[PDB]
Every structure is written in C-alpha cells, then in structure tokens.
Design an enzyme around this catalytic site. Structure first.
Site, PDB file in Angstrom:
ATOM      1  N   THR A  13       0.869  -1.442  -0.006  1.00  0.00           N
ATOM      2  CA  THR A  13      -0.120   0.158  -0.103  1.00  0.00           C
ATOM      3  C   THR A  13       0.766   1.339   0.096  1.00  0.00           C
ATOM      4  O   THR A  13       0.423   2.064  -0.611  1.00  0.00           O
ATOM      5  CB  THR A  13      -0.926  -0.234   1.165  1.00  0.00           C
ATOM      6  OG1 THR A  13      -1.387  -1.254   1.185  1.00  0.00           O
ATOM      7  CG2 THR A  13      -1.715   1.041   1.709  1.00  0.00           C
ATOM      8  N   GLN A  60      -0.636  -9.305   1.020  1.00  0.00           N
ATOM      9  CA  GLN A  60      -1.386 -10.542   1.224  1.00  0.00           C
ATOM     10  C   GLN A  60      -1.191 -11.601   0.273  1.00  0.00           C
ATOM     11  O   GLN A  60      -1.639 -12.870   0.198  1.00  0.00           O
ATOM     12  CB  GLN A  60      -2.976 -10.137   0.914  1.00  0.00           C
ATOM     13  CG  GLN A  60      -3.304  -9.703  -0.425  1.00  0.00           C
ATOM     14  CD  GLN A  60      -3.081  -8.285  -0.652  1.00  0.00           C
ATOM     15  OE1 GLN A  60      -2.010  -7.465  -0.046  1.00  0.00           O
ATOM     16  NE2 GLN A  60      -4.058  -7.515  -1.366  1.00  0.00           N
ATOM     17  N   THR A  90       1.786  -4.158   4.467  1.00  0.00           N
ATOM     18  CA  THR A  90       1.612  -4.273   5.924  1.00  0.00           C
ATOM     19  C   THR A  90       1.079  -5.737   6.178  1.00  0.00           C
ATOM     20  O   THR A  90       1.679  -6.250   7.142  1.00  0.00           O
ATOM     21  CB  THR A  90       0.830  -3.070   6.398  1.00  0.00           C
ATOM     22  OG1 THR A  90      -0.304  -3.130   5.849  1.00  0.00           O
ATOM     23  CG2 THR A  90       1.369  -1.808   6.326  1.00  0.00           C
TER      24      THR A  90
END
EC number: 3.5.1.1
Lengths: 327, 326, 327, 327
Positions: A13, A60, A90
């Site tokens: 991100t 992810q 993250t």
C-alpha cells in the site's frame, strides 16, 4: 561519505493508489521505487539512496519464492551497501520480517517499511515512514539488532513485531517485549535489543534452497472442523501450526487429527489465536507425549516461518522444541 | 436479595492442579456447589442456586452446548432474577456472543471464568464469581445484553475477547471498551452496546438441534487453498476468512472462496488482526464477489453470526445487512 | 543449597489488611515481614528466606530518608545473601525502584514487589506476587539487569516500570520499552535487558549522604498558576521538574518563572504529565538556550529521582542533560 | 445541499509550521483558518464551511478567557449553523473538550480536532484529521453525544478523551470507556454514547461569567513539598485538585495542607496521576471526614474543569461529590 542505502521494493500500500485522496478504495502495485524515492527528496540529506524494484505485489500474496529471492539478494549484495530498506505490504510484513531475521547473514541494518494509507491518500503515512526507515538503516547503532521494522516513528524487532489494528497508522507494535527505539528528528534512542538469536547466529542457510518445507495453519474455535487439518495431512504437509484457543488449546476433533499427524511424519506446533503471550508447556497439553512443539510467544504466522526453517535442519520434535526455545 | 442461578459448564474456574505453585491443571475437577461454597460471601448479596449443565474445557465448546444453554436460559428466565454462567476462558468470547444474539430473557446474564485454577495461589476464580453475582444482582445490568465479568470489569458479549494467553487481566473489549468497572461491590455503568442483542434479534434456536456448518480458514504467506477446498468439498454452508490486515486473502484462498461464493457458499471476510473492522471499500470488491465484510467481529465471532444468518438466508446482501445491525 | 534470599519489608498493601475480604477498605503497614513469609509456605521449596523490617509505611508517605536507609542497607548487606526482595506499597514503588536502580551497587538480583489487593481480600494477589518475586531474585539470569519490579507474573526494569491503572492487579507496565521477561511455572524467559546505565555503572554513591538535593514537581494545565514554581524557587530548591502538557510544554506563566530560575542556579527538567513517550528536544522549546534539560522517557516522578542524584554530581545544565541521556 | 459547518480556529499545531518537512522543529499558529480550509479542497464535497479565527495560541497557553469566549460563541451561534469544528492545540484539547462538554447548550454536533505534526511536516496528519472532524460534524448521528474529539479516524467523547503519548499521531484515546465510533471512507459506525450528563443536561451556565473560580493542581510523589499546596491556599484559591499516587493517595505533607484548607472552605478533589482508573471513595481516605471529593475517572486536569464549574454553584463538599458522580 553519507551512508550508502539500498531500497528493495516489493510492492504494498506504500506503492498503492486510489482514484480519490478522500475515499478508502485502493489497489496495490501502482508506483515504482523511483516515484517513492522522488516523493522524499530529503533522503539525499541523510543517505546516498539506490532503489531496485524486486517485485510489486500486495503482501497478502507474499510467498516462499519472494522470501527466497529477498534473503538471497540481501546476502549477496550485503558488502555493496551500508544497509537496506525493504518497502513492503503491511498485511504480512511481520512474516517477511521474521523470515529475514532468521536467514539474513548481513549484520548491517535491514529495515522493512510499509504504509497503512495509499500514496494517493490525504495525510499519507508512506513518505515520512520511508524517511524514518532510511534514518534507521543509516544509523550505525541499528546494526547487530536483527532485521527491523520501522513504522510510526518506532523501531521494532522482526521477531515480536505484529499488526494490532486493521487500519490504524499506529498498528505495528512489539506486543510482548516492546520496541527497540523511538525516532525523533532523525535520531534514535535505542534502549533494547532482541536476546533471541538472529541473522548470522542462526543455522538456517537458504543460499542454495529453491523451495521451503510446506507448513499450513489451522484455526481453533467452538465446534471446529477437523477437515482443514485432514486436508494438510492428506497432502503430506511437512508441518502444521495450530492457532489454538487460550494457551494454545485444541478443539477435541482437531486434537485427534494432529495427534495422529505428529506420530506419522508431520510436525505439529501449538501456537495461539490469542494476540499476546506465550503458548506454554506445563499447562493442559504435554507436548512431548504427542510429539508437538509449544510455540512460545510466536503467533501462528511467525511459528510457521520458524517451523519451515526448523524442518530444513531436522524432523525431530525435541530438536524443533530446542529451536523454538533459541530463535 | 435477588435470586441468582449459576449454570456451570466446567472450565479452568472449576479445574485443579496437583500444586498451588505449578501451572499444570485439568478442567472439570470441581462441581458447581464446591465453587459456590468456596465464596461464602455470595450469601451477603444473593440467594444462589447452582446447576451443572455440562463439565468440559471450553476448548471443547460446541453447537450442542450452545443450543442447550440458550434454551435453558429462555425456559427458566421467569424462575430467577438473573444468571451467572461459569465457563472456560478459551471460548468464553464465542459462547458470550452466541447467547447475546439467541437469549430472549432481558434480565442479567453474566458469564465468568478464571485464568488460574481453583487450586492455585492467588486464584482469580473466587473474586471473579463474586463480582459476576454482583453484576447479575444489579438491576442496572438488565437490557445491556449478555455480559462477561472478569478482573473487576463488565464487558459486552459482542466486543469482549482474550488479549493474552495467561494474564488474569486478559478479557478486554478491545474496540469499544468496557460497560463499567466494579469497585467495592458497585458498578458505575457508563456504556451500553448499540448493536442489537437478545430480544431485538430475529434469531430463535428454541426448536433447533443443529446450526449451519461454518468453518474458519487462516491467511498467511504462501497460504494453502486446501483448508478452504476441504470445507467447500464437504458442503459447508459458510466459511469465515481470518484475513491478513483489513480482511485480505492470499490469492489461492481468494480464488477458492470466490468460486464457492458463486456456487452459493456464504463467505465472510474477517481478520486475524486483533482490533479494528474488516471494512468494505478497501482492496476487495465484496458486492462483485458476493462476500460479506465482518466489521469488528473477529473470525470466531463472525462464525457465530454467520451460522445464525444462515438459518434465515443465504443472500449475501441480506447477510451484510445482518453484519451491520447485530 | 537453595539460594539465600533476604526480604526487606517497607510496609505496603501487601503487609496491609482490611476489615472484610469482600469490601474495599484497608490499612497499610498493618502487619510484618515474618507474617508475610508465613502466609507463603512454598517459599522454602525455592530459597532459604530471611526477613528484616526496615520501616512500615504506606508508600504514599515514601521519602528520601527511607530511600537512603534502603540503599545503604542493600549495599552493606549485599555480601552475605544471594538476592533481595523488597516488599513495598504500590503507589510509589516505581520511584523507589528507579532510586535503587541508580544507587545500589549490589549486582545480585534486587526485586521489588507489592499487592494491589489487601491480605485479607478474596483472590489476594500478594501471596503469588511474593512467590514470583522470590523466583526472580533466586534466578541467576536476574543478576546484572538492574533493580526489578515483579508484578502480575512479569519482570519489569526499575527505570521504565510505572502504574497504568489505579486499582487493576495488572497495573504495573514498562509502558515505553516493555518488560524483560514473563514468569510461568517458576521459570523466567528473559528476552530483554535495559540499555541505560544502572547500579554499579552509575557514579551515584549515597553511602555517606544523609539528605538529597531538594527537587519539587509542578503540574501544567490550562490557566496554570505560577505560584507553585515560584514557591519552590523562593524556598531555594536545587531542582524543579515540570509535568508539562503534551511534549513537555509549559504554560506561559510557568515558562516565565522556570526560565528565570534556570539562569540563576535552579536546575529545570521538562518532563510530561502524558503517561508514555519522550519529552524530546527539537520540538517547540529550545532547551539549550533556556538552560532546561529534556527528561526523555522519564515521567515527572522518575525525572525527580534522576535530577536529585545528578545534583549530587553537578549543577551545570549541559552536564545534567548528559546524565539524562545516559541513565 | 450539503450541511453548513462552522470552523472556529484557536491555533495549535494543526495551524503550526517548521523550516523543513522532515525536521521535528515547529511553532504553533503560523497559518490561518482560510489557509487550513483551502489545504483540504475536498471539504466542499461534504459541507459548506465558514471559518472564524477566534484566537491564535498554542494550547499550552489555553486559559479561562478563551474557554468562556468559545462556550458563549457556540451557544449564540447554534441557530445559524448545522455544526461546529473547533481547531485547537493537542496538549490541552482534552481540557477544552471537557469544559465545552459541560457548558455548551447547543446539541448540534461540536467536534474538536488538532494535529500531532505541523502542517509543513511530511505526512502531516492535520489535513485528513480536519476532513474527518467535518465528516463527524456533518453527521447528524453525532448530535446529542456531547462535545467530541476527532483524531486518527476515531470519534472520542470529551469527558474520557486524553493524550496517551507525547508525540504519537494516535495519542488521543478514551482510555477508561473507549471510543464512540471509528471513521472509514467518510462514514461513522457509532456503537457507544457517553452515559455521563453533558451539554443541555448540565446546570452549568457561563453566559454572564467573565471569570472562573481559581482551581490549581498539586502533584504527589516521594517526599513531595507542601509548598505548591501552601502557595495556592495563601493565594486564596477556590479549589485544589490533587494528582494523587495510586488510588488518589496523598504524601503526608500535602495531605496535611489540603486537610487544613478543606476545614476552612477550600474545595479539595482527590484525583490520581495514574493515567487510567478511578479515584474511588472507601479506599484509604475518609473523604466525608476531611471534606474531600473523589474524582472518579476524571484525571487531574479534567477534575479541575468540573471543580471550577461545580464552584460556580456550590462550595459544599458533599454537593460537589454529587456533581462528580453525575458529570
């Protein structure tokens, strides 16, 4: 003469984007390392930065092959640079931080960093988080502390660091043992360092490995199905980590399946879905009777990193427990 | 003095070990009357009547005990001034929310456990039980939903969770905080849950002997699709994902759950992250996939609400509605 | 043999009893050390315990005279015992811990313990607290980590340890840098040690001292009175610690009195009323120009301990700021 | 048609500025209300905003005159607007939030917001905070909830909100009872409302007051001087709040001064320097006997706010305690 600092970009991100500054919608993978570095011209005040784009994925979708590529690159290029920053998603930074903490053989600083707000957001946290990650990697006092995570003006060790909130800029905490240092005005007051063996003090060597032992995670809760555990065993998984209830306790039908598994060639680690505290011996489960291993303060996803690496060395549950008590 | 009924289910609170100064224990050594006799001061504040419903470690908590407990409280509501349920810690947070959605008695229903076995030095269970009876005795506790009373704190069934594997102070409402603190046998209530509970929910289990099949799958780096593929292969009604960060899914697991959602399996996205909402409007187009966003419900609480939803509907949008109201 | 451990009792809620078990009223320094031992028969499985009553006060009345007595006795009696536990009230245990952390030159384990509930209360926390404090003092891995506080199964360094809650048994936390270790089943897994200098690595020596420099604490808030700061200056105080607002900031009238005093012989430390985080340099106040010292992570009552000691060595602000960077 | 929202600007770090995006140094009050508003063009998507710069101070300098100004303005202007955002310094925002929460009679939304980084900082938090404060003031569901603080995507009640950390952008937390709602994608899911009496449900009427009763705050700690307390008594202070040790306990010499003063009519409230938890009745202090009030969960600066307002109606200690159990 300024510290030489390599940035290895992996995506996340911090390099993601939305169509609005003031809407939450975003997608990862929009922005290269050149663009991130350029958004922080103040880096040239503190380091000679060189950026390479290793990959660009959302964390992810982090995987064993990106972990191998990263550890190999850091290990081979160590002597070129005074330290590394890795820009990362993250969601699984706490996994990649720990895998590197155990396989990186460079005792020069390796600092991981991400953003909880996309590059395009109002009050984006990425640019200052990147600044502080370079401050950290350039600080001579950052060496020999293992792989680090720097988020929200805080220097956190790779072993104990985890995400505490789904969205908060302040999500990353070392929830059992606390942070190593706080960053203020580009200076760090370090009052701690991990006692657990890391980096060049571990026996793990992935230099010539192209795959890791297969290790899955099974959740426990009321009326848990055994089907997840059975599926991993049916596939000949090298190991299973249990996210146990309370102090690493097993729903009866999961317990049944993992007991068979531990006596038939699958390693079993008891961890806990509970976010802080050790999964301990001397409670309700005699690990050695079943051939299980207690994870200590390692959460499910950390315990899976250490179990994959233990299995490159041994299948012996007593040896695996010794490794879970040292690293 | 109110009439207070203790419904005992087992757990560490009724467990014992061979030494007060070692950590080792087994659950279920001790019956309800023994517990009650351990705290003679209960007499000072209540007329206490104990019944053993089951005697198990909460790690073995399951759909049949939930159905027994909710039926029991609903059947016996008229007969008592309130309820205390003694229960293991490990799944107390699941039982609490099940009951919070399914009990229609709006008198006080207070769950309580112990992090130390009744045998241990400085055992926490006696004062906990004591404070749970205080809570169930206070008429202010009514209409607040099912409660958990641990470490001098009153916590709502929806938000309460364990934060620490061994700490006596483990039980917290990590997103919205406690309803009140207990000092000298009095509560100052400053809060009540806005989310609909007990008699404001459409969920009735009075004639149900089972619940829809809902599994949880974990996400992590290089995650196996095989756990999700298992639950789908078995015809599970619903799968909760314990997502990474804001309810995100490893690619493999995402593919399997997106394929299942189209075949009709209910999919809720939750998060392994211990605090905060799994939100809509982030990285995942939930409407495009027919997925439901869990909000602040963690994966085990998400399962509780998904099972009940699945008694009423399989429509995603209608499950999202229920996940926005309860 | 089992190690020889000395319990030094100072009083506290841990020696304090109430009228009931199920009502919150209690008196402190009620009963004695030998009473406190006899309540915990299991101590003899883990050590040979001898107790001495030093004083018997509620720690709210703790003072320089008890501090000096405690430190001289620990330093004098060090040679003849394997370790110490100090029973103490909770209210000011964090201050005594850091005084002792600075002035004790015994590097054998020194552990402070109390209790948040009375002796006679349901689920009294004192007995197991005392048991674990003796485990900690008996552990050879406890040596050389400073003065410790052992509460709620956790080993906390003297420097960072503080109260978080007015009544919670789990109130004691190292809120900035986390704990050193957790106690489970009579064993500690140490993963941290405080990097700031302590015990025999400090130049503080109170052996020949019978009084300490005078340090007062003033509080900041909207419309704050300067009368307290002026009263300490008129009284000729050696130092003044500010519980500042936010990052150590001063109400205008307090700024004025303290700035006048810092240039005419009063040492002035800016700390914060905010419970975690450093009072930093490099923010809104130019400390060097006023002759103020920034407290770092020391909260007002901790900064007071270090400021009284620093004033036994120096009155120079740059040198006090150096002590504040090192201890 | 979007709502009409009034920004009242009082200064602070939200309006502050430093020489560098990356250095920590700043000063409050460098940019005015209209500049803040134009830095967040997206406010026009969600409201019709009108700004008024009421004062321009660091909140370390907040004072009774600004409080009276703000309460009378909100009260007078209630009918001309749909909702108020007050931009303010962080350090005393928690004090102002509470004063307004007791004195404002407008039950339309009233939201306070600040910034832990100056407007010039890289990754400045003020812009999106301000965006969120206006989202919160625009949301009718915020009405009737008392005065609010919006910081770090969170809606916090004026009574329980406090600073947790000296520098953290996530420092504002409702540390006893938690927050009322989280903000995401411009929306709030409210799950809580303060049960304590606020705004229209309080008796407190400042409309004709140009000054507030004099209330000071004295800190407790080992060996605490009585001089702060004696200074406030000599000055004829109307009340004193004690930042006690533990559960509102007082050092001997401060206890003696405060006891003597309550006997002759000084209002004395026992609060705690401990950051969470209540200062209770029926612990070690007989409030009834001494003429003291226990502050409950009100921290010392919050207790001051309610004591000054209690003192506009009564000096009777038992009447003041009944006020401290209702607001």
């Amino acid at each position: 003469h300024l510290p030489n600092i390599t940035i290895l970009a992996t995506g996340g991100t911090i390099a993601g984007g939305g169509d609005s500054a003031t809407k939450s919608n975003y997608t990862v993978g929009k922005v290269g390392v050149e663009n991130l570095v350029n958004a922080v011209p103040q880096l040239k005040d503190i380091a000679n930065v060189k950026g390479e784009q290793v990959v660009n994925i959302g964390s992810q979708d982090m995987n064993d092959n990106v972990w191998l590529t990263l550890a190999k690159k850091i290990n081979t290029d160590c002597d070129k640079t005074d330290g590394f920053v890795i820009t990362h998603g993250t969601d699984t930074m706490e996994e990649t931080a720990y895998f590197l903490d155990l396989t990186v053989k460079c005792d020069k600083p390796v600092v991981m960093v991400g953003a909880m707000r996309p590059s395009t957001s109002m009050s984006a946290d990425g640019p200052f988080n990147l600044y502080n990650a370079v401050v950290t990697a350039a600080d001579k006092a950052s060496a020999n502390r293992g792989v680090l995570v720097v988020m929200n003006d805080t220097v956190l060790d790779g072993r104990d660091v985890t995400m505490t909130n789904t969205t908060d800029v302040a999500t990353f905490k070392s929830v059992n043992y606390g942070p190593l240092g706080y960053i203020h005005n580009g200076k760090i007051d370090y009052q701690r360092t991990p006692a657990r063996k890391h980096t060049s003090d571990t026996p793990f060597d992935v230099s010539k490995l192209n795959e890791l032992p297969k290790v899955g995670i099974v959740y426990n809760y009321a009326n848990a199905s055994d089907l997840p555990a059975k599926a991993l065993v049916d596939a000949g998984y090298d190991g299973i980590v249990s996210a146990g209830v309370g102090n690493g306790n097993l729903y009866k039908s999961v317990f049944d399946t993992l007991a068979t598994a531990a006596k038939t060639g699958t390693a079993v680690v008891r961890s806990s879905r509970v976010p802080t505290g050790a999964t301990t011996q001397d409670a309700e489960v005699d690990d050695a009777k079943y051939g299980f291993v207690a994870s200590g303060t390692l959460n499910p996803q950390k315990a899976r990193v250490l179990l994959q690496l233990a299995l490159t060395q041994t299948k012996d549950p007593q040896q695996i427990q010794q490794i879970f008590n040292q690293y």
